[PDB]
C-alpha cells in the first residue's frame, strides 16, 4: 500500500457525491469536519497516536450556550461519525452509526452524559489491556483498512 495509491484515487477522482464538506470549529485539532453522503449527514475526525498510550485518541465536542465544552447529544448528532486512522505504513477508518456511539456512551442522552473523547483500536493493535481489549472487539465490526485484500 504505496500512499501513491491514494492520490491517484484523489487525483483522477472525477466528483465526489460527497456535498457540504466543511470545516468544523471546535475538534480542529484532530481535521473536524462535517459532510453528507447520499442523503446522509457525516462528522469526520483524524484520531491521533499519544506516545505513552496505544490506540489512537480522538476528540469528538461541542460548545453550549454557556460556552462550556460538552459531549455532542443524540438528538443533535450527524448520523454517522469516522474516525479517520493515518499512522505511516498504515491507514484505515472506522465508521460509527449514532445509535452505536449511543449504546457506547460516546453521546449525551437524557439518562446519561455522553464523553468528549475517546481511543479506537485498529485491528492491527496488538498486546492490548483488558479494557482497550474489549473496546477493540466492537469498534472492530466498524473498521475498514484502505489496503483491503
Same mark, same amino acid.
Given at each position: 500500500?504505496?500512499?501513491?495509491?491514494?492520490?491517484?484515487?484523489?487525483? %483522477?477522482? /472525477?466528483?465526489? /457525491?460527497?456535498?457540504?464538506?466543511?470545516?468544523?470549529?471546535?475538534? !480542529?485539532?484532530? /481535521?473536524?469536519? +462535517?459532510?453528507? %453522503?447520499?442523503? /446522509?449527514?457525516?462528522?469526520?475526525?483524524?484520531? @491521533?497516536?499519544?506516545?505513552?498510550?496505544?490506540?489512537?485518541?480522538?476528540?469528538?465536542?461541542? @460548545?453550549?450556550?454557556?460556552?462550556?465544552? $460538552?459531549?455532542?447529544? @443524540?438528538? #443533535?448528532?450527524?448520523?454517522?461519525?469516522?474516525?479517520?486512522?493515518?499512522?505511516?505504513?498504515?491507514?484505515?477508518?472506522?465508521? %460509527?452509526?449514532?445509535?452505536?456511539?449511543?449504546?457506547?456512551?460516546?453521546? +449525551?442522552?437524557?439518562?446519561?452524559?455522553?464523553?468528549? #473523547?475517546?481511543?479506537?483500536?485498529?485491528?492491527?493493535?496488538? $498486546?492490548?489491556?483488558?479494557? #482497550?481489549?474489549?473496546?477493540?472487539?466492537? !469498534?472492530?465490526?466498524?473498521?475498514?483498512?484502505?489496503?483491503?485484500?
Amino acid at each position: 500500500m504505496y500512499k501513491s495509491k491514494i492520490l491517484l484515487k484523489y487525483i %483522477f477522482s /472525477e466528483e465526489s /457525491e460527497v456535498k457540504d464538506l466543511t470545516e468544523e470549529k471546535y475538534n !480542529q485539532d484532530y /481535521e473536524a469536519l +462535517t459532510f453528507s %453522503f447520499k442523503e /446522509e449527514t457525516y462528522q469526520s475526525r483524524l484520531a @491521533k497516536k499519544t506516545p505513552t498510550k496505544a490506540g489512537y485518541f480522538v476528540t469528538c465536542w461541542t @460548545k453550549d450556550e454557556n460556552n462550556c465544552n $460538552q459531549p455532542y447529544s @443524540k438528538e #443533535a448528532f450527524a448520523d454517522y461519525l469516522m474516525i479517520i486512522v493515518i499512522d505511516e505504513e498504515l491507514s484505515g477508518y472506522f465508521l %460509527f452509526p449514532r445509535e452505536l456511539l449511543v449504546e457506547k456512551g460516546i453521546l +449525551t442522552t437524557f439518562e446519561h452524559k455522553g464523553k468528549m #473523547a475517546f481511543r479506537v483500536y485498529p485491528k492491527w493493535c496488538n $498486546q492490548l489491556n483488558k479494557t #482497550a481489549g474489549q473496546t477493540q472487539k466492537w !469498534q472492530c465490526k466498524y473498521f475498514l483498512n484502505t489496503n483491503k485484500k
